[PDB]
Structure 1
Amino acid sequence: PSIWSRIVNFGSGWGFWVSPSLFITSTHVIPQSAKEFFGVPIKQIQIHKSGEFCRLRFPKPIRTDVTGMILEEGAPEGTVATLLIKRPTGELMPLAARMGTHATMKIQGRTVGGQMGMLLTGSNAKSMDLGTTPGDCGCPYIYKRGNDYVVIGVHTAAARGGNTVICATQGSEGEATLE
């Protein structure tokens, strides 16, 4: 099956099926108060919210047609990852983005954390087919390792110019404390 089949509507945004039981999305697109997800009661779902990242594990497999997939935390700096954007009009937009350091961004009255990236379309990211839109939150960032696909996070925010984007990852890594 196609990889785009793993990207489904969820709340006000999108979500990605990493496996028949694992489903990742952005936190600010989840329904604020719901009773069930994909026919499963909320109490029977293992839900982990780490910053803007959100993961859902189900007690029984849901999407039995997809296979397991690698979910790393970010990508090496300089990697040209791909954001897979789905629009409600039916279009599929693979947008390339060079990934940089992890960072926080001041947006609205708050701050949003994740790995920073810059789209390769440059200033042309103001166009609708060359950049992101707030409705694309939850769409996945992936890149190819060998002959396999690796998802590193989901779209959560973009800067005022639209060129710089933020990828929500499983969590930030602090430096160790030895002995």
Structure 2
Amino acid sequence: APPTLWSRVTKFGSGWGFWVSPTVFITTTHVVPTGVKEFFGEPLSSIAIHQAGEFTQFRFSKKMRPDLTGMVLEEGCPEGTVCSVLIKRDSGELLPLAVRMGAIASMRIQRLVHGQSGMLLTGANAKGMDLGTIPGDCGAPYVHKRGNDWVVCGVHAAATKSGNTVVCAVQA
């Protein structure tokens, strides 16, 4: 994946989020800080905030990342297609994990979670930090190409104990 795409992945709350455009930022609800009066130094009164299940979208009045073009945010990931989860680690690694996307699901982990499931294509068992997702990774974007353009369709929310199955929050 290209440098500008990775530069959209931003540390946020207890996880990450993704700049879809100069003004739109998406993340996973449970990583969002609570009881705060600003995000990225902007007061709440200059941010349109919409949280729907585990999907959170912010729209800033100020142009926060004018270096960026606006990309398409899909309402979910195309079922059956291969996406990439653009994982950044706080130790500096970039780990784009290939994932084949499945159906909208609800499942009990450890608690019920609701989003789009997928299967990592990284190994036989994607347990641990080298082949799969770990605590701290939530909010990472699920992306794929459409024609010559990249699009984003979800943000990382969960993974099963074995680690092979992942769940992204989606807008719809």
TM-score (norm 2): 0.95
Correspondence list, 1:18-167, <5 A: 18-108=20-110, 110-167=111-168
Where does structure 1 lack aligned partners over 5 or more consecutive residues?
172-179
**Identity over the aligned pairs, expressed in percent?**
66
CA contact (8 A) 2:14 2:136 kept: yes
Shift of 1:84: 0.4
Q: Provide Cα deviations, 1:42-97, integer angstroms capped at 9, x if missing partner.
A: 13211000100000001121111111000001222210110000001100001000
TM-score (norm 1): 0.91
State the one-letter code of the partner of 2:47.
I
Distance in 2 (CA, whole Å) between partners of 1:75 and 1:81 is 8
Count of matched residue positions in the alignment of Structure 1 and Structure 2: 170
CA contact (8 A) 1:118 1:165 kept: yes
CA contact (8 A) 1:123 1:161 kept: no
Distance in 1 (CA, whole Å) between partners of 2:163 and 2:45 is 38
- Name the SS for the 2:112 alignment partner: strand
Distance in 2 (CA, whole Å) between partners of 1:101 and 1:28 is 21
Larger radius of gyration: 1
- Name the SS for the 1:150 alignment partner: strand
Task: Give the aligned CA root-mean-square deviation in angstroms.
Answer: 1.2
CA contact (8 A) 1:103 1:116 kept: yes
